Paper text:
To gain insight into the 14-3-3 binding mechanisms of different BR components, we next performed co-crystallization experiments of full-length 14-3-3κ, 14-3-3λ and 14-3-3 ω in presence of pBRI1869−874, pBKI1265−272, pBZR1169−175 or the longer pBZR1169−184 peptides (see ‘Methods’ section). We obtained poorly diffracting crystals for a variety of combinations, and refined structures of 14-3-3λ—pBZR1169−175 and 14-3-3 ω—pBZR1169−184 to 2.8 and 3.5 Å resolution, respectively. We found the C-terminal 20 amino-acids in 14-3-3 ω to be disordered and thus crystallized a truncated 14-3-3 ω1−237 in complex with pBKI1265−272 and pBZR1169−175, yielding better crystals diffracting to 2.35 and 1.90 Å resolution, respectively. Both 14-3-3λ and 14-3-3 ω form the canonical 14-3-3 homodimer in the different crystal forms. In agreement with our structures, 14-3-3 ω forms stable homodimers in solution, as concluded from SEC-RALS (size-exclusion chromatography coupled to right-angle light scattering) experiments. Extension of the BZR1169−175 motif to include this second phosphorylation site reduced binding ∼10-fold (RISNpSCPVpTPPVSSPT; BZR1169−184). Importantly, inclusion of this site in a longer BZR1 peptide strongly reduces binding, suggesting that differential BZR1 phosphorylation may both promote and inhibit interaction with 14-3-3 proteins.
Brassinosteroids (BRs) are vital plant steroid hormones sensed at the cell surface by a membrane signaling complex comprising the receptor kinase BRI1 and a SERK family co-receptor kinase. Many phosphoproteins of the BR signaling pathway, including BRI1, SERKs, BKI1 and BZR1/BES1 can associate with 14-3-3 proteins. In this study, we use quantitative ligand binding assays to define the minimal 14-3-3 binding sites in the N-terminal lobe of the BRI1 kinase domain, in BKI1, and in BZR1 from Arabidopsis thaliana. 14-3-3λ and 14-3-3 ω isoform complex crystal structures reveal that BKI1 and BZR1 bind as canonical type II 14-3-3 linear motifs.
Residue numbers in the entry:
A (entry chain C): 1171 to 1175
B (entry chain A): 3 to 240
C (entry chain B): 3 to 235
The structure:
Amino acid sequence: SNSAP
Amino acid sequence: SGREEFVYMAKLAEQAERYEEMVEFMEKVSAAVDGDELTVEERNLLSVAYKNVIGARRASWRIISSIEQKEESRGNDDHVTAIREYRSKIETELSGICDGILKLLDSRLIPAAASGDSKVFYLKMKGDYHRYLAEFKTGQERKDAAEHTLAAYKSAQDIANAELAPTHPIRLGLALNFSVFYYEILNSPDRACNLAKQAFDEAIAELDTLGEESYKDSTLIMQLLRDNLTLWTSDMQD
Amino acid sequence: SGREEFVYMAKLAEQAERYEEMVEFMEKVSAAVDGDELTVEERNLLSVAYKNVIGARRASWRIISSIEQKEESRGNDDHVTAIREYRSKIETELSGICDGILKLLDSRLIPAAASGDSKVFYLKMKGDYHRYLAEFKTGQERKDAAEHTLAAYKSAQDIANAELAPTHPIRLGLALNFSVFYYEILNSPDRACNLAKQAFDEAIAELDTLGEESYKDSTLIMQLLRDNLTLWT
Ligand SMILES: [Co+2]
């Protein structure tokens, strides 16, 4: 899963 | 002045990729701005600083943890003990970094926002760093971290739903991180998928509202939203 | 025991990309080995540790120096002064890192080296870290650094020419870094090119005539040599 930069 | 000197030093620390010093510089900027609010630029420098300092220990923690599980699965219990001691050092650093940003956010920036822009931004960030705590803490500390994360994200979501366009990069980032919170921390894939899907649809629905300046930021998050769904929709399979 | 524990800790620090700690671990292994030689594996862990710790300050130094030059070109003397203070902090760290590894090489590892492989390896590394000193030092301090670099590389080259195959990745790496030394520090491109060419030709001589298992490493170095020659001339 990826998150906000 | 004070503030401007340390902002410039923080930019230099970023260039040099000496991020512990970048946090120091931005902590000095934030402390120098007590009654006044941080600028958009200072807010972003602070966020970059802490994101990179915590990101590096987070990477190290995941790698040492994979090694710990593999060596534990192996009969070298002697190696496993050493790996656990090392992971403990990393968790200590992680805890100290989160404490630093949560206190600074909690004591100055969240109270000082009164902008909704910055209210959502700083609330999202509070939730983020409680979540990074929840990633490695155990027992009651993990429970407390996850609960504060949910509460921070909820408050952020309320302000964002009420005062930010669906295409707003802060609201989109909040949706992204809240969905990640559900999938990874709360183990609610159904909930995570539902939230990411809603944020994407509501953004393409009202995709007229997006700003030229806002567009690179929003589109990036929206693609990440789809990418997450792409994996979740496939781990609803796998 | 101790030695084996700290070798393992160094591998963990490497995995975690915590290289300052990896350097600490390898310094404790090396210090724990008085007179004995580092294994090849341990030697390489030490070199990787220091290479990454110094590489990061070298990168930061180059970036801060470019910013200093631009801000100098802009007449922003306040920015330039702040940048100079920051670059001075970085140069302090650079000096201490090179000094740490040079001391470790000079008091234990270089004296203890018992074969041409490790003799050349540690001398090359001495030349490397004097060169990293020469990269930012100025005036007489720079002259002294460059002379020590040349002396380290020369001693290494003598042993390597005399006891290592031209295709030995250690000898090839030494030739590569020595040529770079000429080009960048001494600004002697003719010498750098000539050295790289001679080392390459001497390596291609026995390329097909001899080689096994060593081949991916040697061929790798020889390709870097070719790339450099292609760029210099
Ligand atoms: Co509580």
